Amino acid sequence: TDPTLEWFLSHCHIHKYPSKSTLIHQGEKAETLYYIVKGSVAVLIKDEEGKEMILSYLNQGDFIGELGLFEEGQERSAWVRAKTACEVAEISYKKFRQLIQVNPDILMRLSAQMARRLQVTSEKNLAFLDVTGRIAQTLLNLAKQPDAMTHPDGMQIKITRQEIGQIVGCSRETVGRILKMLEDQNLISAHGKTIVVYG
Template sequence: MLKDEDLLELLLAQCQQGDYAPRCDVIRPGDPSDTLYYVVEGSLSVQVRDDSGQAFVLAYLHQGDFLGELGVFLDTPVRNVHVKTRTESKLAKIQYARLQELLQGELASRRADYLRMFGEHLARRLMQAERKTGDLALLDVTGRIARVLLDLAEQPDAYTHAEGVRVNVTRTEIARLSACSREMAGRCLRDLEARQLIVSEGRSIIVKGAGKATALLEDV
């Protein structure tokens, strides 16, 4: 069985790659669902909007993440999410039809390996979604924001800081990630800062002692 790195190398050789500026739309609701994406570099947000137009962030994607892998297994005619870049990004993409040709042709001997790899990515995404649903049911807003900050502190675009880990995120983004209003997010962040659990610095937040994964949640 080939390692995922080797599988990716073979797949990327068949993909188109392109550079995207920050805050660039990659997918909009209603777009045809015909392409698999892979994040080579950068960071993206996956959002949905409710009936009132309020945006919620489902996930952030980083280097090594797939986008649209569900379409490898199921026929989904159109997209229902809004995906845009957060930073300068490089994406690789391949149409599902072309991917199926490869898996039935020159990559046929590795078909099971590719389906396993795509399935594992989907399973991790499902586990994250289940935990987020549990957080909405079991945690108050401050607890959800604490969870969001801990998750962000473990992402590849976080930075080590003398007091913990620095994450680049705005109050609006935190509100969308934790399913609350921007005003509520601001109040909760001020509360966490008053308790010396975080430090706000402009468009970034220092999560103190983020290396202890449960400390922040235990304190809230």
């Protein structure tokens, strides 16, 4: 059992959100503070060219819209929507601040993840971003070449890591540093001399 969680939730209101239903709409005045008891949700924005862009998926046990607890008035840059029928608890920010006085443990939890949530995004300057822009261009251009292969996901090209570095003007390593990053962004794919560009 979980002494705190159970206490915490006895101060929250749990409701169900059928898939695709929206939990928080975008310029809403933040005052909660949502805790996912079960199921998953998505954080969406619209980029230039008004396409839905997924910022993150949040799963059971995670919290929703902190960033509004430490920023009065703060709105909701990007709005929360359910992906699967899920139960979510929500508590007045005002009342939550009271819980923290009583037993500052829950605060520890939420405080948590984030951290485990940051320890995953980071370990990542101007000089660096420049090369990242150049390499992305090289791959973008090669996909439009007549010698490009057609891939179910997009276009597949042929080039060595050293060739990328020679073209852009960087070490073979810097290429791997960037290729790995781009690959983690689900934008490209690297295996030997074969590289595939998505979209």
